[PDB]
């Protein structure tokens, strides 16, 4: 078979880097009780570089040893790049959302061998579903595979906001002190209100976080969450994003994209929060309207922004989000971490292992199979 | 009466300053269950910047009125400064660890009307207490009032520390992308041992914050915490921190300097850990040996360091602690965020009624009084 790969760049200081460490922790299980991949082997350690181009997903041995032909490239803008290109005899395209190989219904036709659309990290977003449906491919995921890094990297940013951390950093570098101008924005978190659009696997693990910092905890979702959770952690449900925001300091988003949440987070919205409110997007970009962001933190209504999520990505040299005032930015990477990559690469090869041997796939890693819908 | 009270200098940019908001949670107990500060009247506004010279802790009306001589400088070097020269016929002394005005042996024995220091936030680690008990003169301190910034600040410090945060903000702002880069150092906090050095009001509320992210949990301290405490949170006690050193990826201090523990974060205690672990210092600088926290950072037996705490404070343009590598610093601050300084200076105001009101002083704000030590 042909397995088509497409990876981000390697360090600019070359492949591998030196790591600060040599081991990881070894996690057994999420939160709700799904195992963590269990592939027969693993031809890498834990904690090493994997989804860049160098690193491969530490697929290559295993797969040329099958006799399988392994494509591995950062290239695959338009129909010239060499992912277009080897992509109609490809048996299998995987690629990581990071930096995303897009099947479109139009690639999806001119690939006449696709049988395996396979995502290294969770989700599908760069993927045609309908398309798929009715192709007939599998579209398949390491779910939950970096969901706790996602969550972490969320709470990191709405403490580093509130506490006015990044300027106050700056300060001690540049060789400053100034207190009064590193206090003149700092808060503490305690007490404030804070919620979550959504209450999914990262969602969920955000508010569990969040609670004993003795935050008043609030959420919104298309789909209400069980009571038990609602009384485990003191939620307050809204029915929608715009009541919630109304009585809010912070908000996460942890919602995916569609039609609902599409620039959610415009003008409108944010002007129904109190003026220095603060807001953290590690979801998807296109749910805030990328210049009433801008124009938000210009005023003040928004005392700061966070988030690792844009609009192109990668984001432009120009993106204005990257020195508009009050960010929190980094690039696309919370689920990206050393430690994400070693579950996420883990269950792509345990993945190609249940697809090479005939073997079913779990079902909580199917998004569509064989003309079938998981979800929707 | 004459009141010198020592504060830091104002912004920059002029007093007030731009507030992002206009209120603040109003908090109500701290969670040992001591109530926040009771003054019969506060004259700001909660949010208000109040410990640079021009915010005067919001008591300058106050003690006027009553007749109350109200003297507010920055300058506390040397005995040539405003201070040494007002203090010897000043009454009460106020100043904030932040920028303290230090009560040694010699300026006790020359302030003849010195009858109360007075603490603005916690402590009293620039205040002579073996001079004080012998002068007669009571020392008080506003219990608790920060200290709920402080562990927010020490897990902010964590968390940006092991994902890389710092770093990978710095490439967004520059216009780079470099997801290979930003991540070829981040970690995952879950699973990962952490440890306090002790479990005191501060380090609790850090223990308690933790939890949630699904760490190991381990402190150390001279006095041991009740076993409800531990079957809480599922520590794991050591008797001293060179044992528990041996088995944590992460070590936050939350210890009082004294004699065992001053340079207790030399070279011996830093090689003891696993070759790229992290500490945090939000306490005293002192407890960490300055050039061993370089050599390590600079040799990678620590993958990072952060803090607030330094030493010379001010910390001197030419401070090591500014640019060694990867370091999360902030000035002094954590304990003087808006929030902190509403509680604090409240606090102070309470005090100062209690004093000139003949009332007792609440006895937790009492560090000593009339020839009494309340701790050792």
Redesign the interface.
């Known amino acids: 078979a042909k397995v088509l790969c497409v990876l ?6 070359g492949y591998p ?6 081991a ?4 057994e299980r999420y ?1 709700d009780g799904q195992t963590v991949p269990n592939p027969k082997h693993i031809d890498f350690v834990p904690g090493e ?1 994997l ?2 181009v160098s690193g491969e997903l530490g697929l290559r041995s295993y797969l040329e040893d099958l006799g399988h032909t392994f494509i591995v490239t950062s290239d695959k803008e338009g129909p010239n790049s060499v992912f277009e290109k080897e992509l109609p005899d490809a048996d299998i395209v995987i690629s990581q959302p ?2 995303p190989a897009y099947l479109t219904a139009e690639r999806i036709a001119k690939a006449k061998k696709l049988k395996l659309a396979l995502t290294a990290g969770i989700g599908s977003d760069h993927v045609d579903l309908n398309a798929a449906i009715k192709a007939g491919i599998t579209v398949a995921e390491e779910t939950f595979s970096n969901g ?2 996602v969550a ?2 969320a ?2 940013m709405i ?2 906001l509130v ?1 006015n ?2 300027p ?2 700056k ?3 540049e ?18 209100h804070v919620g979550t659009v959504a209450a999914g696997r990262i969602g969920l693990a955000v508010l ?2 969040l ?4 935050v008043k905890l609030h959420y919104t979702a298309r789909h209400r969450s069980p009571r038990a959770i609602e009384d485990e952690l003191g939620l307050t449900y809204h029915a929608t994003a715009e009541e919630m925001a109304e009585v809010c ?1 912070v908000i996460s988003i942890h919602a995916p994209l569609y039609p609902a949440t599409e620039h959610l987070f415009n003008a409108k919205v944010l002007n129904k929060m ?4 603060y807001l953290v997007n590690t979801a998807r970009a296109e749910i805030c309207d990328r210049d009433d962001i801008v124009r938000a933190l210009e005023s ?1 209504q928004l ?1 700061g922004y966070a988030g690792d999520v844009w609009f192109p990505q ?2 432009p ?2 993106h204005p989000w ?2 508009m005032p009050h ?8 689920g ?6 070693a579950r996420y690469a883990a269950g792509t090869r345990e993945i190609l292992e249940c697809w090479f041997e005939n073997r079913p796939i779990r079902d909580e890693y199917l998004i569509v199979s064989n003309g079938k819908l998981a979800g929707t």
């Open positions: 981000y760049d390697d360090p600019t200081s880097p030196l790591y600060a460490r040599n990881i922790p070894k996690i939160p570089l989804g860049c990071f930096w706790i890094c972490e990297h709470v990191m403490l580093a506490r951390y990044l106050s950093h300060i001690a570098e060789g400053g002190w100034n207190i009064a101008d590193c206090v003149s924005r700092s808060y503490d978190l305690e007490g404030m569990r976080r609670k004993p910092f003795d300091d109190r003026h220095g409110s003040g005392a990668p984001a040299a120009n990257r020195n960010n929190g930015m980094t690039p696309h990477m919370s990206s971490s050393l430690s994400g990559q």
